Structures are given as structure tokens and as C-alpha cells.
Design an enzyme around this catalytic site. Sequence first.
Site, PDB file in Angstrom:
ATOM      1  N   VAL K  58       0.834  -1.205   0.000  1.00 45.52           N
ATOM      2  CA  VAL K  58       0.000   0.000   0.000  1.00 45.52           C
ATOM      3  C   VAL K  58       0.869   1.256   0.000  1.00 45.52           C
ATOM      4  O   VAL K  58       0.627   2.194  -0.767  1.00 45.52           O
ATOM      5  CB  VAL K  58      -0.991   0.000   1.176  1.00 45.52           C
ATOM      6  CG1 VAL K  58      -1.845   1.260   1.116  1.00 45.52           C
ATOM      7  CG2 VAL K  58      -1.883  -1.221   1.104  1.00 45.52           C
ATOM      8  N   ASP K  59       1.899   1.291   0.852  1.00 44.95           N
ATOM      9  CA  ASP K  59       2.723   2.500   0.947  1.00 44.95           C
ATOM     10  C   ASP K  59       3.701   2.658  -0.215  1.00 44.95           C
ATOM     11  O   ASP K  59       4.122   3.786  -0.502  1.00 44.95           O
ATOM     12  CB  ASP K  59       3.483   2.542   2.272  1.00 44.95           C
ATOM     13  CG  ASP K  59       2.605   2.949   3.432  1.00 44.95           C
ATOM     14  OD1 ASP K  59       1.404   3.206   3.207  1.00 44.95           O
ATOM     15  OD2 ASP K  59       3.129   3.052   4.561  1.00 44.95           O
ATOM     16  N   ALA K  60       4.086   1.559  -0.878  1.00 48.61           N
ATOM     17  CA  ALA K  60       5.201   1.610  -1.824  1.00 48.61           C
ATOM     18  C   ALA K  60       4.992   2.647  -2.924  1.00 48.61           C
ATOM     19  O   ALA K  60       5.924   3.379  -3.279  1.00 48.61           O
ATOM     20  CB  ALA K  60       5.434   0.228  -2.435  1.00 48.61           C
TER      21      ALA K  60
END
Lengths: 266, 77, 77, 76, 77, 77, 77, 77, 77, 77, 77, 101, 52, 52
Positions: K58-60
Site C-alpha cells: 500500500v505504501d510503496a
Amino acid sequence: ENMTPQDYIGHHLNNLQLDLRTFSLVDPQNPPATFWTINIDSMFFSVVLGLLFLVLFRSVAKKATSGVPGKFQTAIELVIGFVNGSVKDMYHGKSKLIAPLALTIFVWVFLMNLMDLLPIDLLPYIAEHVLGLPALRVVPSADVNVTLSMALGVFILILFYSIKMKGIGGFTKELTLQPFNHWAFIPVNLILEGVSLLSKPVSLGLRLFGNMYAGELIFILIAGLLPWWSQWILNVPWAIFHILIITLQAFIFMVLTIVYLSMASE
Amino acid sequence: NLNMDLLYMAAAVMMGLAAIGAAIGIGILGGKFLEGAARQPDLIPLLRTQFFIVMGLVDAIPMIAVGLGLYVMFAVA
Amino acid sequence: NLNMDLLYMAAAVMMGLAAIGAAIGIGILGGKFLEGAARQPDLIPLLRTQFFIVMGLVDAIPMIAVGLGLYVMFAVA
Amino acid sequence: NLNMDLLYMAAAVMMGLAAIGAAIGIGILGGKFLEGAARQPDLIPLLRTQFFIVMGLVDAIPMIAVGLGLYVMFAV
Amino acid sequence: NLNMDLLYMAAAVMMGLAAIGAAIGIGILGGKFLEGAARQPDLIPLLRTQFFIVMGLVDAIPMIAVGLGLYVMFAVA
Amino acid sequence: NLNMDLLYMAAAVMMGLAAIGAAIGIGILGGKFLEGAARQPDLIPLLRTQFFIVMGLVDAIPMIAVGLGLYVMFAVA
Amino acid sequence: NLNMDLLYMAAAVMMGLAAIGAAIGIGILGGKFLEGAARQPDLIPLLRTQFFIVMGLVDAIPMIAVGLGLYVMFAVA
Amino acid sequence: NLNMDLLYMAAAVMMGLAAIGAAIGIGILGGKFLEGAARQPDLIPLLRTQFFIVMGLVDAIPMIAVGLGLYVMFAVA
Amino acid sequence: NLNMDLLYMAAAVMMGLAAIGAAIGIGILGGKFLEGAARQPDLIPLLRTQFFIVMGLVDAIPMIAVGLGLYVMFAVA
Amino acid sequence: NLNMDLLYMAAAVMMGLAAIGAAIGIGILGGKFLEGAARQPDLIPLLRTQFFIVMGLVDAIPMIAVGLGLYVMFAVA
Amino acid sequence: NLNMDLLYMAAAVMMGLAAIGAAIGIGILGGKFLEGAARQPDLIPLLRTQFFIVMGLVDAIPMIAVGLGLYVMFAVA
Amino acid sequence: TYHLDVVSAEQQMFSGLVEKIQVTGSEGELGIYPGHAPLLTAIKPGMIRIVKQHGHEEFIYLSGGILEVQPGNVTVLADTAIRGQDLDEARAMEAKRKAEE
Amino acid sequence: MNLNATILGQAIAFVLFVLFAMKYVWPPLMAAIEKRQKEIADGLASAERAHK
Amino acid sequence: MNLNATILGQAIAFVLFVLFAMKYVWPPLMAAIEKRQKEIADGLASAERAHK
């Protein structure tokens, strides 16, 4: 042949208008702005399709029997089944006219839309290059004025049925008190509720008009902006989907007519 | 001249927002209709009737927007 | 001149937001209606009356917006 | 001149966002009204009273915004 | 002749909002279809029929938006 | 003249966004009170007390925004 | 200078809105697919064959948006 | 002159987005508080405590935003 | 000079919209993955495989959007 | 020179959007915290630890955005 | 003006949309972490390792945007 | 008012027409008001509150069971002793051990 | 595209086709269907009377 | 432009479209035959058996 692709497209977008005062034909090269110029093509296909519906159904209805059921007779009884099934539950009053109103609207609107499946260049070819006519298109419902005619007739009917079945004495109360019911709000109340009333027929007309205008536009774009090998490949799935659109849209127009009137009268 | 540049943009904003409104509205409404169709089978025709009733009300304002966008594009510009 | 080019834009933005607001509002309201009609067939005629009673207030402001959009477009022009 | 049509634009923004606010807020509120009405069928007249109590609060700001849109549009 | 460059922008906004509207509309509709299939797997050819019917209503307005935007981008510009 | 014609837009943004914020915040918050009132009516008065306390917190910031919108529009002009 | 600049801007808006459309639509649709997988796992080879049917529809419109985005950047320049 | 004028717009956007953030966030959090009060009325003095613990974190950033909006409007102006 | 200086803004729009699309899509999809992993914990290495199957389809459009954004910044501008 | 006004606008956009994200993300997450604490009220000390573990991640990117907004307003502008 | 101030605006859009995306995606995902942790309070180590597996993805894609926004502010502008 | 029966396998605990009751359902306490919608759930051990028609409020302890509702008629199928998988397992093992003997 | 006096002729056509279906298509087809269904009613009722 | 290509494209499109209609949209008329046979024919036959 002077047809550039974008100029070619324009001739589809142009109608065959008459002139009421001289009975002359309005040419596509110069369309002045004037309301008093009936679109011959739209009216011709509208009335011809209505007449063919009347001819076929009245012909077998005039001869109908309760014996061995016939091939076309089965189709008549099945569309009568769908229409009567809608009417049978959405309407509850006595009125005679509701059912044939719905039936004629359904079948006739569908017939206007059904012309859209006909290849776009062909019948305009028989219009221009045979009988010498300056322009053509073959889907009446893709023209505004038939749809607003039907929708504003439905508007007349909304007024007529509502006043018949509850009178002005309660009609004024409804159109002025709602929705807040408290007497200081009445002048502001009527402003909102009136346009609510007119929004019903207007939406009917524009809904049908938009869908059919866009359908003929897909055919126009296919013919004008794309080469042969892509014309067929893009046109085939489009036509298949447009079948569902026209069937459901006709049914929707009928159902909504019945429902608007029922909401006012019942 | 300066007219058509903005009149197409007006029509575009109109019918784009109308597209959002109609698509999402019938999305939510149809999703509830289909869970109703999975939950209680053979009430599909009755729930279909209610679905069309409500659907007509959802499409009202968006079809006004669609008609007036068509007007602006092919009448005013 | 510039006046009409911005006024079509103004009417466009107002009716577009009206369309989204009204359509999604009735979408949610109708979704609860259909789910409430799903489980029990008894009170379809009852919920479908509360539905109009509430749907009136959903359309309260969006038709102010639509009325003023039409007013701008055809009378302020 | 340039003054007036920007005033019409500003009114459009204020009153359109008022439309979103007053529409979605009462969508969310009235949906819970209907499911509650669908659960305890005797209580509709009670819950509808509560519904107007809170409806007064939801419309509170959108009517300021609508009054200001109309004010910019017509009064100013 | 600066007229061209705004017309691509005006086409862009129509097809962008149309893509959002249609994609999320069919997202919400198809998700309820799949939960319906998860419950009643012997009904899938029936539920798919009902799904096609609802989808035919969802797709109308976004398809109008896309058609008009494509037209603006190529026939007008 | 040139100065004031943008302060009406500075007002417009604050009160549009504050209207959406306040309206939908109280929408969610009141929906839960009605849901809780569906199970135990005798807890409807108890829950009614919770509603107003929390609603005071929900619309604190939106009223700073509405207040400075009115300040800009009627005191800076 | 600023003709060729604004073409790239138009492609930016087109493909950005297309990206949101496709991503969110398949997010919702695939979430319902996974819940169907979790409830009856030996049924996954059927639901996955329905997922690739609906998933085609979802991206169909966001992919003609994307196609015209690359057209605007590379072909029109 | 624009060095006065744009700062009201720049504060408008800050105190609009702060309002939407705080209002929607507390809306969601408080709604969960309300349902938890509906199931377990004995625990209201506990859930109230954790609600005020958690609610001070939601407001951490929106009050940076609103304080700087007030600063920009009145100090730098 | 404004021609490339706006291209940085074009890439900003493109890959920011791609970021929100991809992040929220993977968020929803992973949420169903974790609830699946809580309902059948002996099943996690199967469902995680399916998560990697469909997460390749979610990112397919956002990844090309991000690639074209990086191209617009480093190659073109 | 006029340039300094756009820096307040840039910080306004950056910090307001970070407020949206940091408010709503913690709203969703804390709502699930309370829904879990209503269920198992003897696990408040454990869930309240997991809540800070994940809440540390939710607002990280928003904290970078808020720090850079403060830098832009006070240090640069 | 036009060189530096638009680069701060581009950074603002990049690192604000990354805030929206990376905050709400993790809100949605972490809510399902805390629901599972309430149903299966013995699984919390297993579900939190799954949560980090999903959270990295999700953060990548927002972290590209955050790092590149820092690049645009300090290295370019 | 509605007809309520509280019953067990051995004896019928209570019956009659009632205005409302409060019962500890599997998910939480719930009040069954007149003409209530259909319902089915397991109910927890403890006191449940009856208010019989003409307002006669009362407490009945139940060791657990199932609650069901439909528009005309409502019933509770109560257990006699606390039912739990551990207690049931103890009883089952007592039967097995006796069987070896 | 353009508003037009075509709107009036369509109203004429509407009322005409409604009238041609009202007095000559719906009444005959209603009787035919009812006659077919009356056969069903009469038959099953006859069998049941004999059964009594 | 050469307009012959558009006529050819439309002919090919119409041909393939009609194939789709014949193979997938024509069979639903079989459901009409079922509605003939079971409701009308067998209903009246059952009524006649009941009379006898």
C-alpha cells in the site's frame, strides 16, 4: 464527390425541413433559425411506423379467434401480456384509457428507435440520389420535437387526471403546503414543487432523446471517421448492445408514464 | 472565436458530472436490487418493478443535465 | 461578449453539482428501500409511500439549483 | 463588465456546494430513518419526530449558503 | 489558432469523468453480483441475466459522454 | 473594481467546504442514533443525550469557517 | 511554446482520471471476488471465470481513455 | 495588491480542508461510539473516556490548519 | 520558461492521481485478504497467491501512468 | 515582485490535503478500535496498543506533508 | 516568478495526493486488522505480520511520490 | 399485545399475552415490542424482564436457550442448565467412563 | 439541435394512434384472451362438480 | 474520400450482426411456443377431458 470526412458527417446531422408558408424545402447548406419549418423525415417515419403497428395488430385483432393459436397471434398476446402485466399492478383506478395509452406509447416509441439499426448511408442514398431530396435521417426519436410532443402530452395528462380525480381544492393544498406544511413557507414551497411537477415530463422527453441521438451518432462516427475493416469490427458489438438499450428504454418510457400519472391520481 | 472554446467546456463539465451522478446512483441501487435477487429468488419480477420505479427517479436530474449539454454543444455552439 | 461565455459555465457548474447531489441521494435512499422490500413482501406499498415522503426533501435544494441554472442559462444568458 | 459574471460564478459555487451538503446529509440521515421505520413498525410517528429534529440541524448551514448564493446573485 | 488546444482539454474532461463514473458504477454492481454467485452458485446464468439488465441502465450516460468527447476530439478539433 | 471581485471567492470556498463538512458529519452521526434507537426505544432518550454532546464537537471547526466566511464577505468586502 | 505544452497537460488529466477509474473499480470488484473465495474455496475456479468476465467490462472504458492519452502525447505531439 | 488579495483565498482553502477533515473524521469515530453505546449501555462512561482519548488525535492536525488559517487571514492579511 | 515548467505540473497531476488510485485499490483488495485470512487461517498461502494474482491487474494501469510521468519529468522536461 | 503569494498557496494545498488524510484515516481506524472495544471490554489495554502501532503508520506521510508546509510558509516565503 | 513557484505547486500536488492515498489506504486496511484482532485475539501476531506484508505494497507507490516531491522542492527548486 | 411462551423440555415456564420484554440476545440486550418483526437468535444466561399485558413487570431467570419471533406469536426455548462445550464434554466423558465399568 | 413546429404534428399523430387502438384493438383482444381463459375455468369447475 | 469503403464496412457489419441475431436472439421465440402449447393447448384439452 465533395465529401471530406468531417463535412460528410454534417449531412447526417441535417434534417429534411419544409417551410409552412411556402411549402419549400430548407437546404442543408444554409439553415436559418426558424421554428416554422417541419422536419418531413421525422414526421414521415413517425406516422408510417404508427400506421404499420395499427395495420398489423388491428388486422389480426379484427380476425382473432379463441381456436388453435397462431404464430403471429402468439406474439400479439405476449406483448399484450407484458403491457397488461405492467398496467395490472401499477394502475388501480377505473380509467379505460390508461392501458391503450401505455400500449401505443410502448410499441410506437420502440418502432421509432428500431429504425436506428438500419444502415446509415443506404436510405439517405435513396433520399438524395433517387427522389432528389436535399437531406435525410431515419430515427424520429433522435429528433427533439417528437419526444417533447409526447412528453408534454403526458404533462397535459398529468394535469388533467390529477384535477379530475382530486379537484382543485386539494390540488392547491398539495402544491402550496408541501413539503414543510407550516403556513409561513407556502410562497417558497410552491416555487420548489412546481418545477418538481414539470421535471417529470421534461425528463421523459430528454431521456429518450439523448439515448437515440447518441445511437445514431455512433453510426455517424463509424461511417465518417473509420476505415472499412474497423467500421465492421466496431459496428457489430455496438449494434448488439444497442438492441438492449432500445428495448429497455421503450419499456422504461411506458412504465414511467403509468407511474407518474398513478402518483398524481391514485 | 472565443465562444466555442468555453461553450464546449461548459457542456463537458455538465455531462461529465451527470455521468458520475447517474452511474454511481444506479450502481448503488442496482447492487441492492441484486442482493435482493440472490436472497429471495422468484421475486425477481416484483423487485424488478420496484427497481425500475426508483431508477426513473434517479435518472431525472442527470437526464436534464444530459439534454442541456446536448443543447449547448449542438445548438448554442 | 465574455458575459455569455462565463454564464453558460456558471449554469453548467450549478446543474452538474445538482445532478450529482440529487442522483446519489436518491440512490442511497432507494437502496435502503429495495433491501427493506426484499426480506418481507408485506409492506412494499407502505415503504414505497415513506419513500416519496422522504424523496421530496432530498429533491428540495437540487431543484432550487436547477431552477436557478435554467434561469441563468435562458434569462441571464 | 467583468465584475458581474464573476459574481454569478461565486454564487454558483456557494449554492452548488450547498446542494451537495443538503442532499448527501439527508440521504445518509433518511436512509437510517427508513431502515428504522422498517424494523419497529409502530414507531414511525415517533422516529419521524426525531427525524425533523435533526433535519433542522442538517439544513442549518446549507440555508446560510443558499441565502448567500441568492444574496450574491440578486442582492449584490 | 488557439481554438484547437482547449478542445482536447474539453474532450479529456468528458472521457475522464465518464471513465470514473462507469468504472466505479460497474464495480459496485458486479461486486454484489459476485456475492450473489458466492451464495447461490446454481443460479449464476440467471443472476448474470439480471446483471446484464441492470448494467444496460448503468452504462447509458457514460457512453453518451464518451461518444461526445471522441466526437469533439476528432470531428470538431 | 479590481480588488473586491476575488474576496467573494475566498468566501465561497470556505462556506462550500464547511457546508459539506458539517452536513455530512452530522449525517453520519445522526444515522447511528437512529440505528441504535431501532433496537431499544427505552434507550432513545439516553442516546438522545449522547447525540447533542457529540454534535457540539462535530460542528466546531465548520463554524469557525462559516464565521470567517461571513467576516470576509461582510467586513473585508 | 504553449500549444505543445497543453497537449501534455490534456493527456495528464485523461490518464489520471482513467487510472482512478480502473484502479478503484477493480478494487471493489476484486474485494467481492475474494469474499466469495473465502466463503467457498473449492468454488474459486468458477468465480475467477466470472471475475475475468466482469473485469473486462470495467476496464473497457478506462482503456480507450488510456489509448487516447498515448495518442495525444506521442501522435499529436 | 495581489499580495493582500490572494491570502484570503489561501486561508479559504486551508480552513475548508481542515473543516472537511475534522468533521468527517469525528463523524466516523463518534458514530462507532454511538453504536457501542447502543449495545452496552453500562459501558458508556468507559467508551466516553476512550472517545475523548482518541478524539484528541483526530484534531491534532486540523487545528494546526485552522490556527494557520487564522494567522494568514489576520496577521499577514 | 513556462513550457517545460508546466510539464512538471502535468506529471504531478498524472502520477498523483495514479498514486491515489493504486493505493486505495490495493487497500480494499488487501482488506478482503486479511478478513479471509482471519476466517480460514489454515488457508493463508492459497489466498495470498490469489492476492498476488489480482494485484498485478490493479497496478497495470497505475504503473504505466507512473512510468509516463517519470518520462515526462526526466526525458521531456 | 509578486512571486511570494504562490508559496502560501502551495503550502495551503499541501497542508490541507495532509489534514484530510490524517483526519479520515484515523477516523476509520479508531472507529474500528471502538467497535472492537465494545465487543471485548477486557481487551482495551491490548487493542489500545495495536491501535498506536498502526496509527503510527497512518499519519507518517501526512506528518512529512505538514512539516514541509510549515517549511514553505515560514522558512522560504 | 514562473520557474520556482510552480515547482512548489507541483510538489504540493504530488505530496498532498500522496497523503490522501497513503493515509486512507492504510485506514481501510488497518480497520480490518483491528476487526480480525477482536474476533481472534490469539492470532494478532499472525495477522499483524500479514498486515505488514500488505502495508508495504500500500505504501510503496505513494513513497515514490513523496520522495520525488522532496526531489522537486530541493533539487530542482 | 402479543402471545409469548417461555418453555423448556421438561416444563413450560411461562405463557400469556404480553406488552413487551427485554432479553439478553447473543449480540446484546433486545426489547420485543408489540407486533415485532421476525427474529431468531441464541440468548445468554441471566434474568430476562417481562412486562405482561396490563403492565405487570416481572423477572425470569433462564439458563440460556433460543429466542424466536414472528408477528402474531413469540417463544423462547430455554435450557435447564448452563450449556457449554466444556460442561458437555465433562458429561460425555462421565458417560464413557461409566461405560467401561 | 433546433426547436421546431414538428412538435404539433406529432401530437396529432399521438392522439390518432391512441384512438385507433382504444376503440378497435384493445377491446377485441381483451375478449379473445378472456374467452381462452374461460375455457380453463369452465373445464376444471365441471370436473370438480362431478367429483362432489 | 472514397465512400465505397463505408458501404462495404456497413454491409459486413450488418451481415455479422444478423448472424448474431439469428443464432442468439431468434431462439427466444421458442419460449413463445412453450407458452402456446402448455397454457392454451393443454389447458383446453384438460378442460375438454373434464367435460367428458
